[PDB]
Amino acid sequence: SSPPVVDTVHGKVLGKFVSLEGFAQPVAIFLGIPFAKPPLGPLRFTPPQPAEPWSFVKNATSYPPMCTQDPKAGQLLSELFTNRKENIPLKLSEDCLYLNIYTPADLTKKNRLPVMVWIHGGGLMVGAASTYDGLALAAHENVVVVTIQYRLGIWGFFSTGDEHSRGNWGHLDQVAALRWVQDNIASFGGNPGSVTIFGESAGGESVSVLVLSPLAKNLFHRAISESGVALTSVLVKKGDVKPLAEQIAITAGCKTTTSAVMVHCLRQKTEEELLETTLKMKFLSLDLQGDPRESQPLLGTVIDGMLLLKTPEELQAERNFHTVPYMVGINKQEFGWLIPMQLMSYPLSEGQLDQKTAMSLLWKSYPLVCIAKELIPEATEKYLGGTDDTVKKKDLFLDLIADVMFGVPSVIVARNHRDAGAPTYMYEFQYRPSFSSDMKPKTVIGDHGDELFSVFGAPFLKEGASEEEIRLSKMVMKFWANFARNGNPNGEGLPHWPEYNQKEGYLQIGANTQAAQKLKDKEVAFWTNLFAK
Ligand SMILES: *[C@@](O)(c1ccccc1Cl)C(F)(F)F
């Protein structure tokens, strides 16, 4: 019964025990541990500072707020992605730099378990750590699971393109959480010499950015990007970021006289005024009015000169990144339902698409796929021209967006990582979880986020999982935690997962799981040639 109490650098923390049926050792859970000073007032749009130390024992048994964000979209994504039986309602706050810890170690003995640090998705605009319950993965695989938060949206990524607001505050928060883990996780039974970062969607892009950042040197030892990398271009702003900053300033009621003037004005706004600004900007929603080249669907990663010194393409060309073991994976249908239908309000209710509407829509999709207008016909013809059925054309259009956004970027990242001599692994995930939304057509399989339910052991926390689904989660969890332990997912009882080498082996994960070769090879060739003009 007696709750666990752990000493950290900054003070003592009190957690709680939670048992998972069939595991003798209850899991010690610590909710809402601060890893930075709350980024309020003048600390807005600045790097995170260390948390101030506290006397006595901090009660770490309540979920922290989630970072300020569109509450409706944030709650929706939490409901769609959570592995728990009931979604936990969360408060909003700028005071959100917290992490949650699930340790299966008996804290009365000494333990050095591998640590897995989860970075949540959400487009860099929404999301929360508390969505993801670490209980099942921690108990089933004997790993310490850490879920982190980081500033989002305007708070996390507002950039003037210069020294007055460089940008990438949320990525700096991720780095601060990893340094906290280095300094403290051994008190929770974890091994700071074996930290694996893993994340999905914008969280997978964050993992890829951290692989590219000198600030993350020696903070992690393996990495996993699930459905998102630093070549997912909608998340990485190149070129001139000043137009977006000025539009944000104006919407908030601020002058644009200079960068410093904009940033100081935004620093005086209340949280509520910046949230009103966020909602007026209509982020994460396909912009159908005006020139598509001016659409800004999210505030994201920039080349700031501190976290990222050059573009991801330039960094991989010079082999300037952390050559840790790296697992890069995609799902069979990344654009099948949840991103267009639930997050971005795509005009695809009809379920048939003719080629003319497809070209018009692909042009409107410019902020996602970056295809010049003169190249829209060729691109569309390559995917939709081979059939005459317009339902098939709609499905092939979804394939096209998925390949440009996720599949091709992921293979290019994996190839460049392999070519720097690092151990590299890839997967393609194909399963339709029973936990899918009731709104989701039964023909969508391997949608964006579908692997989450297997990675986080949803069949052991939510009800109604089939026996096949339970088996799948046990295998995925074991692959992931073997990778955390050894930088190699393989082990006894598991299908062989080849290294992604020059033969380009990868694992097809699903009801039938087996190795395959050359993922997306034809598509990479096509799109690389197309984007070279
Ligand atoms: C992902 O973070 C996401 C959302 C929108 C665009 C791109 C990406 Cl990677 C989410 F939200 F989980 F789907």
XYZ file of C-alpha atoms and ligand atoms in Angstrom:
546
model
C 0.000 0.000 0.000
C 2.592 2.517 1.262
C 3.196 4.906 -1.657
C 6.689 5.064 -3.184
C 8.863 8.141 -2.508
C 11.860 8.920 -4.707
C 14.660 11.462 -4.294
C 15.445 13.578 -7.359
C 18.026 16.329 -7.852
C 15.384 18.985 -7.110
C 13.496 17.234 -4.294
C 11.468 14.254 -3.136
C 8.447 13.056 -5.126
C 5.529 10.863 -4.020
C 3.946 8.520 -6.577
C 1.384 5.740 -6.447
C 1.267 1.971 -6.964
C -0.923 0.501 -9.706
C -1.122 -3.253 -10.265
C -1.694 -4.898 -13.615
C -3.448 -8.260 -13.125
C -0.941 -11.112 -13.316
C 2.195 -9.085 -12.577
C 3.383 -9.538 -8.991
C 5.237 -6.196 -8.764
C 2.948 -3.152 -8.924
C 4.097 -0.368 -11.210
C 5.204 2.844 -9.492
C 3.580 5.808 -11.273
C 4.602 9.472 -10.939
C 2.343 12.008 -12.663
C 3.323 15.615 -13.367
C 6.997 15.877 -12.431
C 8.286 19.305 -13.583
C 11.414 19.209 -15.711
C 11.650 22.993 -16.250
C 10.581 26.270 -14.734
C 7.038 27.123 -15.941
C 7.515 29.224 -19.120
C 5.286 32.132 -18.042
C 5.495 35.885 -18.613
C 8.946 36.938 -19.867
C 9.924 33.263 -20.257
C 7.492 32.879 -23.155
C 9.387 32.389 -26.448
C 12.649 31.665 -24.553
C 14.538 28.415 -23.913
C 13.389 26.351 -20.926
C 15.121 27.059 -17.648
C 15.824 24.427 -14.966
C 13.051 23.738 -12.476
C 13.447 25.444 -9.086
C 14.118 22.995 -6.193
C 11.374 22.232 -3.639
C 11.357 21.418 0.073
C 9.445 18.432 1.509
C 7.701 15.884 -0.737
C 5.979 16.823 -4.037
C 2.705 14.982 -4.627
C 3.076 13.489 -8.088
C -0.292 11.719 -8.328
C -2.361 14.112 -10.500
C -2.227 14.454 -14.285
C -0.518 17.717 -15.358
C -2.264 20.246 -17.601
C -1.684 19.873 -21.296
C 0.013 22.758 -23.103
C -2.349 25.457 -24.370
C -4.011 24.302 -27.597
C -7.343 24.069 -29.387
C -9.254 22.179 -26.640
C -11.710 20.542 -29.022
C -9.067 19.202 -31.410
C -6.858 18.307 -28.448
C -9.595 16.307 -26.729
C -10.559 14.620 -30.020
C -6.994 13.492 -30.736
C -6.603 12.259 -27.150
C -9.812 10.199 -27.534
C -8.630 8.786 -30.893
C -5.115 7.864 -29.674
C -5.455 6.923 -25.982
C -4.743 3.326 -24.983
C -6.831 3.628 -21.793
C -10.401 2.454 -21.259
C -11.641 5.996 -20.617
C -10.045 9.135 -22.018
C -8.864 11.456 -19.225
C -10.132 15.060 -19.544
C -7.237 17.489 -19.180
C -6.891 21.139 -18.224
C -5.086 23.629 -20.477
C -2.203 25.712 -19.198
C 0.952 27.477 -20.287
C 2.333 25.764 -17.157
C 2.754 22.416 -18.862
C 6.455 21.370 -18.852
C 5.897 18.087 -17.032
C 6.617 14.408 -17.581
C 4.981 11.203 -16.328
C 6.939 8.103 -15.232
C 5.843 4.428 -15.223
C 8.513 2.267 -13.608
C 8.023 -1.483 -13.059
C 11.165 -1.676 -10.905
C 10.966 -2.637 -7.232
C 12.286 0.657 -5.918
C 13.386 -0.997 -2.638
C 16.104 -2.773 -4.653
C 18.564 -1.421 -7.174
C 17.558 -1.494 -10.844
C 19.034 -0.207 -14.132
C 16.214 -0.863 -16.621
C 16.162 0.486 -20.195
C 14.284 3.773 -20.496
C 11.816 4.616 -23.287
C 10.905 8.312 -23.601
C 7.698 8.924 -25.549
C 7.195 12.144 -27.553
C 3.544 12.608 -28.454
C 2.109 13.602 -31.864
C -0.400 16.319 -32.773
C 1.156 18.437 -35.569
C 3.207 20.430 -33.017
C -0.198 22.139 -32.334
C -2.071 19.677 -30.033
C -1.439 16.592 -27.886
C -0.561 15.524 -24.368
C 1.650 13.070 -22.496
C -1.246 11.884 -20.292
C -3.039 10.435 -23.344
C -0.570 7.544 -23.253
C -0.702 5.159 -20.310
C 2.699 3.560 -19.750
C 1.386 0.815 -17.444
C 1.110 -2.083 -19.916
C 4.397 -1.553 -21.764
C 6.312 -1.024 -18.503
C 4.957 -4.175 -16.863
C 5.036 -6.423 -19.944
C 8.539 -5.539 -21.061
C 10.369 -4.403 -17.878
C 11.184 -0.933 -19.188
C 10.802 2.483 -17.586
C 8.316 4.474 -19.687
C 8.541 8.304 -19.590
C 5.930 10.415 -21.370
C 7.003 14.048 -21.912
C 5.281 17.328 -22.701
C 6.590 20.274 -24.710
C 5.288 23.687 -25.705
C 2.934 23.625 -28.712
C 1.641 26.021 -31.339
C 2.410 29.713 -30.885
C 3.998 29.038 -27.479
C 6.243 26.274 -28.788
C 7.162 27.419 -32.274
C 6.626 31.149 -32.809
C 9.611 32.367 -34.837
C 10.596 35.783 -36.232
C 13.388 34.147 -38.218
C 16.036 36.046 -36.246
C 17.541 36.394 -32.782
C 14.485 38.063 -31.231
C 12.513 34.777 -31.425
C 14.550 32.025 -33.064
C 11.809 29.384 -32.672
C 11.830 25.668 -31.815
C 10.965 26.266 -28.123
C 9.076 22.943 -28.015
C 12.105 21.047 -29.305
C 14.241 22.792 -26.677
C 11.675 21.524 -24.150
C 12.160 17.992 -25.472
C 15.926 18.355 -25.030
C 15.403 19.676 -21.475
C 13.248 16.662 -20.643
C 16.005 14.345 -21.937
C 18.626 16.123 -19.810
C 16.316 15.745 -16.823
C 16.089 12.025 -17.605
C 19.897 11.783 -17.718
C 20.171 13.506 -14.336
C 17.312 11.722 -12.521
C 16.042 8.466 -14.056
C 18.406 6.207 -12.075
C 16.375 7.122 -8.965
C 13.353 5.515 -10.655
C 15.141 2.277 -11.524
C 16.182 3.359 -15.022
C 19.527 3.241 -16.755
C 20.616 6.700 -18.029
C 23.124 4.952 -20.268
C 20.246 3.283 -22.233
C 17.613 5.853 -23.258
C 15.440 5.246 -26.331
C 13.383 8.153 -27.704
C 10.244 7.208 -29.592
C 7.323 9.156 -30.971
C 4.583 9.152 -33.569
C 3.522 11.744 -36.196
C 4.981 15.104 -35.073
C 6.556 13.077 -32.257
C 8.382 10.941 -34.810
C 9.456 14.108 -36.611
C 10.701 15.394 -33.238
C 12.745 12.209 -32.772
C 14.244 12.738 -36.243
C 15.035 16.404 -35.441
C 16.766 15.335 -32.219
C 18.871 12.871 -34.226
C 19.937 15.914 -36.282
C 20.600 18.292 -33.347
C 23.969 18.925 -31.650
C 22.029 19.902 -28.513
C 20.839 16.299 -28.101
C 24.355 14.807 -28.083
C 24.686 12.005 -25.505
C 21.034 12.281 -24.423
C 19.774 9.057 -26.044
C 21.093 5.781 -27.382
C 18.346 4.463 -29.734
C 15.554 6.198 -31.629
C 12.213 5.183 -33.155
C 10.232 7.351 -35.578
C 6.657 6.107 -36.097
C 4.960 7.735 -39.110
C 6.921 10.968 -39.225
C 10.444 12.269 -39.897
C 12.286 15.545 -40.454
C 11.685 15.198 -44.213
C 7.905 15.275 -43.541
C 7.931 18.752 -45.070
C 4.663 20.136 -43.641
C 6.395 20.138 -40.219
C 9.631 21.921 -41.233
C 9.582 25.554 -42.430
C 12.345 26.470 -44.872
C 12.918 29.894 -46.359
C 11.272 33.059 -45.028
C 9.222 32.530 -41.848
C 8.517 36.260 -41.325
C 5.143 36.360 -43.186
C 3.631 33.801 -40.806
C 4.985 35.619 -37.745
C 3.504 38.909 -38.976
C 0.120 37.292 -39.629
C 0.134 35.886 -36.083
C 1.108 39.287 -34.656
C -1.661 41.078 -36.575
C -4.309 38.525 -35.591
C -3.280 38.995 -31.951
C -3.585 42.792 -32.264
C 0.154 43.585 -32.420
C 2.201 45.999 -34.524
C 4.733 44.518 -36.969
C 7.182 47.459 -36.853
C 10.143 45.213 -35.950
C 10.739 41.633 -34.798
C 11.515 42.742 -31.231
C 8.308 44.816 -31.190
C 6.211 41.825 -32.320
C 7.760 39.487 -29.744
C 7.417 41.957 -26.878
C 3.763 42.615 -27.767
C 3.009 38.883 -27.920
C 4.731 38.448 -24.544
C 2.177 40.865 -23.052
C -0.905 38.938 -24.265
C -2.785 36.690 -21.861
C -2.978 32.956 -22.411
C -6.632 33.440 -23.353
C -5.777 36.050 -26.012
C -3.135 33.803 -27.577
C -5.609 30.916 -27.624
C -8.172 33.177 -29.350
C -5.425 34.009 -31.859
C -4.716 30.278 -32.339
C -8.386 29.520 -33.009
C -8.757 32.470 -35.425
C -5.758 31.227 -37.425
C -7.597 27.920 -38.070
C -4.506 25.727 -37.927
C -4.572 21.980 -38.693
C -7.382 22.572 -41.174
C -7.102 22.519 -44.965
C -7.142 26.125 -46.170
C -9.510 26.371 -49.157
C -9.561 30.169 -49.600
C -6.923 32.001 -51.594
C -3.582 30.997 -53.029
C -2.466 27.615 -51.562
C 1.177 28.717 -51.452
C 0.189 31.137 -48.665
C -1.503 28.451 -46.530
C 0.072 27.878 -43.093
C -1.476 24.754 -41.511
C 0.755 24.757 -38.405
C 3.659 26.482 -36.688
C 6.538 24.064 -36.818
C 10.251 23.358 -36.829
C 12.528 26.069 -38.261
C 16.249 26.235 -39.001
C 17.032 28.358 -35.950
C 20.818 28.125 -35.723
C 20.798 26.627 -32.206
C 18.789 23.378 -32.359
C 19.083 22.912 -36.143
C 22.099 24.546 -37.806
C 21.050 23.736 -41.397
C 18.257 22.010 -43.244
C 17.722 18.278 -42.637
C 18.716 17.633 -46.269
C 22.029 19.484 -45.851
C 22.715 17.774 -42.532
C 22.225 14.298 -43.996
C 24.351 15.175 -47.038
C 27.266 15.973 -44.727
C 26.502 12.973 -42.444
C 26.193 15.364 -39.500
C 23.805 13.549 -37.162
C 23.771 11.077 -34.275
C 24.488 7.616 -35.682
C 22.480 5.699 -33.051
C 20.376 2.610 -33.888
C 17.260 4.020 -35.576
C 13.926 2.330 -36.360
C 11.794 4.146 -38.970
C 8.303 2.886 -39.754
C 5.142 3.771 -41.610
C 1.587 2.464 -41.689
C -0.047 0.974 -44.798
C -2.591 3.872 -45.177
C -1.131 7.016 -43.455
C -3.689 9.343 -45.164
C -6.588 6.835 -45.157
C -8.966 8.511 -42.645
C -7.874 10.239 -39.424
C -5.713 13.045 -40.771
C -7.999 14.163 -43.650
C -11.384 13.353 -41.997
C -10.783 14.096 -38.272
C -7.920 16.642 -38.107
C -7.859 18.588 -41.418
C -11.516 18.738 -42.609
C -10.628 17.520 -46.154
C -13.426 17.812 -48.789
C -13.610 14.040 -49.344
C -17.072 13.125 -48.064
C -18.163 11.816 -51.495
C -15.777 8.873 -51.695
C -15.328 9.169 -55.455
C -12.831 11.477 -57.122
C -12.454 12.359 -60.767
C -9.056 13.411 -62.060
C -10.017 17.078 -62.480
C -11.177 17.391 -58.860
C -8.081 15.438 -57.800
C -5.738 17.944 -59.486
C -7.622 20.859 -57.934
C -7.387 19.202 -54.495
C -3.710 18.293 -54.873
C -3.053 21.946 -55.654
C -4.974 22.965 -52.539
C -2.808 20.389 -50.668
C 0.354 22.417 -51.456
C 1.189 23.097 -47.759
C 1.209 19.292 -47.219
C 2.880 17.987 -50.399
C 4.683 21.003 -51.984
C 3.952 20.038 -55.601
C 4.302 22.961 -58.001
C 1.224 23.678 -60.093
C 2.934 22.741 -63.368
C 3.736 19.321 -61.871
C 0.199 18.620 -60.581
C -0.907 16.790 -63.794
C 2.060 14.424 -63.994
C 1.834 13.576 -60.278
C -1.901 12.960 -60.465
C -1.599 10.945 -63.677
C 1.059 8.727 -62.119
C -1.297 7.667 -59.340
C -4.813 7.916 -60.808
C -4.346 7.435 -64.572
C -4.066 3.638 -64.509
C -7.687 3.054 -63.535
C -10.999 4.485 -64.625
C -13.022 3.737 -61.467
C -13.374 6.994 -59.501
C -13.659 5.246 -56.126
C -10.296 3.658 -56.887
C -9.079 7.122 -57.897
C -10.018 8.479 -54.456
C -8.111 5.622 -52.774
C -5.081 6.143 -55.045
C -5.146 9.875 -54.265
C -4.942 9.042 -50.557
C -1.967 6.795 -51.392
C -0.314 9.705 -53.212
C -0.555 12.093 -50.248
C 0.627 9.346 -47.859
C 3.680 8.608 -50.041
C 4.715 12.250 -50.282
C 4.085 13.038 -46.599
C 5.347 9.872 -44.872
C 6.490 6.931 -47.004
C 9.106 8.551 -49.236
C 10.477 10.873 -46.486
C 10.797 7.853 -44.181
C 12.724 5.739 -46.687
C 15.029 8.643 -47.572
C 15.772 9.194 -43.872
C 16.438 5.486 -43.338
C 18.732 5.242 -46.382
C 20.758 8.278 -45.328
C 21.038 6.883 -41.787
C 22.130 3.467 -43.072
C 24.715 5.125 -45.315
C 26.339 6.836 -42.327
C 27.014 3.326 -41.014
C 24.351 3.373 -38.333
C 22.196 0.304 -37.590
C 18.851 1.047 -39.225
C 15.551 -0.852 -39.206
C 12.268 -0.256 -41.017
C 8.722 -1.486 -40.757
C 5.372 -1.176 -42.502
C 2.386 -1.691 -40.175
C -0.867 -3.162 -41.522
C -3.690 -3.830 -39.068
C -7.090 -2.388 -38.281
C -7.461 -2.155 -34.475
C -10.824 -2.947 -32.910
C -10.204 0.304 -31.001
C -10.773 2.279 -34.225
C -13.369 5.038 -34.103
C -16.887 3.946 -35.059
C -16.802 6.703 -37.695
C -13.927 4.985 -39.527
C -14.865 2.833 -42.560
C -14.037 -0.847 -42.134
C -11.904 -0.852 -45.300
C -9.256 1.497 -43.836
C -6.367 -0.623 -42.535
C -3.107 0.700 -41.131
C -4.389 4.253 -40.750
C -2.163 6.899 -39.162
C -1.773 6.025 -35.477
C -2.995 2.414 -35.798
C 0.279 0.998 -34.474
C -0.096 2.987 -31.211
C -2.604 0.508 -29.767
C -0.083 -2.296 -30.253
C 2.935 -0.296 -29.048
C 1.251 0.794 -25.829
C -0.567 -2.447 -25.022
C -4.133 -1.214 -25.458
C -5.488 -4.842 -25.560
C -4.423 -5.155 -21.882
C -6.138 -1.934 -20.727
C -9.108 -1.466 -23.074
C -11.795 -4.119 -23.505
C -12.900 -6.108 -26.518
C -9.581 -7.000 -28.156
C -9.537 -10.184 -30.154
C -6.958 -12.867 -29.455
C -5.045 -11.994 -32.623
C -4.909 -8.346 -31.518
C -3.536 -9.362 -28.101
C -0.866 -11.514 -29.764
C 0.051 -8.621 -32.078
C 0.507 -6.200 -29.190
C 2.699 -8.643 -27.265
C 4.936 -9.090 -30.286
C 5.187 -5.347 -31.094
C 5.945 -4.466 -27.470
C 8.672 -7.125 -27.360
C 10.199 -5.877 -30.627
C 10.221 -2.284 -29.330
C 11.712 -3.135 -25.924
C 14.311 -5.499 -27.419
C 15.313 -2.558 -29.609
C 15.542 -0.345 -26.510
C 17.659 -2.978 -24.746
C 19.995 -3.875 -27.625
C 19.555 -1.584 -30.603
C 18.250 -4.696 -32.412
C 14.576 -5.768 -32.165
C 15.216 -9.514 -32.590
C 14.866 -12.250 -29.992
C 13.595 -15.742 -29.334
C 9.990 -16.361 -30.326
C 9.906 -13.429 -32.749
C 9.846 -13.273 -36.557
C 13.242 -12.353 -37.978
C 13.598 -8.610 -38.585
C 16.507 -7.937 -40.960
C 18.673 -4.871 -40.707
C 17.879 -2.179 -43.282
C 21.105 -2.530 -45.264
C 21.816 -2.324 -49.002
C 19.234 -5.096 -49.542
C 16.693 -2.834 -47.777
C 15.043 -5.515 -45.691
C 12.087 -4.374 -43.614
C 9.409 -6.016 -41.486
C 5.773 -6.279 -42.559
C 3.975 -6.110 -39.189
C 0.417 -7.336 -38.860
C -1.686 -10.457 -38.433
C 0.908 -12.140 -40.643
C 4.343 -10.692 -39.891
C 7.387 -11.366 -42.062
C 10.446 -9.756 -43.630
C 10.263 -8.095 -47.093
C 12.685 -6.029 -49.230
C 12.807 -2.554 -50.944
C 10.007 -0.618 -49.196
C 8.712 2.303 -51.408
C 11.649 1.909 -53.854
C 9.620 2.806 -57.015
C 7.871 5.711 -55.251
C 11.118 7.162 -53.932
C 12.548 7.080 -57.464
C 9.436 8.728 -58.935
C 9.119 11.535 -56.397
C 12.849 12.258 -56.202
C 12.907 12.724 -59.969
C 9.730 14.832 -59.898
C 10.920 17.202 -57.141
C 14.186 17.743 -59.043
C 11.947 19.292 -61.747
C 0.671 14.020 -36.426
O 1.355 14.713 -35.414
C 0.522 14.939 -37.626
C -0.610 15.739 -37.775
C -0.757 16.580 -38.866
C 0.225 16.643 -39.830
C 1.356 15.871 -39.716
C 1.498 15.031 -38.621
Cl 2.950 14.070 -38.529
C -0.664 13.582 -35.838
F -1.341 14.617 -35.332
F -0.571 12.686 -34.847
F -1.430 13.037 -36.785
